[PDB]
Amino acid sequence: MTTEAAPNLLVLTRHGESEWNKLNLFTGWKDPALSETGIKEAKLGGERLKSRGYKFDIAFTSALQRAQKTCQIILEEVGEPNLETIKSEKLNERYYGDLQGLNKDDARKKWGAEQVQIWRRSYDIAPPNGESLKDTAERVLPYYKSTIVPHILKGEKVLIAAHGNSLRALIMDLEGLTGDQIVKRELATGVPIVYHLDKDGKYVSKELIDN
């Protein structure tokens, strides 16, 4: 999509809502089963990505079925499966330690927005065994830098399917955020989101969608 030695374009597609999502319980590393909204969202997303005319050169996903699946759907929907859709384990979601399986209500009712926040967002702190942003980023960036820094420089456009945290960390390092400026950002579930990065891999305008 992007031009050679010009503002590189990176599309990010976050899986819609998973089964456990409807229940309103913490996920973590577990691989839940996407739902109609997610699928419909994926399809819609793909149709949204192909409808506008946004073409893909390369694609990146996580090592989770939700995204590993969500990618196939969107990729199969956009009508460009031939695209190179890679999968990364480092592009997974920040571990939730012993929180995996706790209803947000109970979680928030037992940890409040405060503890829950510092527990879920914070920046570097992570719940009992759970991971954090810096960690995820630190372990997500390698894939990015390593296998995503050579093409992003040539002037190619790429897909990315992981999770709020993953993308958060991504956008974080991709934008050069601050410990107290990345926990305020936000993304869209079901509907992708493209970044206007430069020839180095840094934002140069602002995110955007197709829908």
Swiss-Prot record:
Pfam assignment, any one: His_Phos_1
Catalytic reactions on record: (2R)-2-phosphoglycerate = (2R)-3-phosphoglycerate
Catalytic machinery residues: 15, 93
Protein's pathway: Carbohydrate degradation; glycolysis; pyruvate from D-glyceraldehyde 3-phosphate: step 3/5
Entry keyword annotation includes Phosphoprotein: yes
Record InterPro entries: His_Pase_superF_clade-1 (IPR013078), His_PPase_superfam (IPR029033), PG/BPGM_mutase_AS (IPR001345), Phosphogly_mut1 (IPR005952)
Residues found modified as Phosphoserine: 62, 166
Binding-site positions, substrate: 14-21, 27-28, 66, 93-96, 104, 120-121, 164-165
Residues found modified as Phosphothreonine: 37
Phosphotyrosine: residues carrying this PTM: 96
PANTHER family per UniProt: PHOSPHOGLYCERATE MUTASE (PTHR11931)
UniProt cross-references to HAMAP family, sorted A to Z: PGAM_GpmA
Protein name per UniProt: Phosphoglycerate mutase
Organism of derivation: Schizosaccharomyces pombe (strain 972 / ATCC 24843)
GN (gene name): gpm1
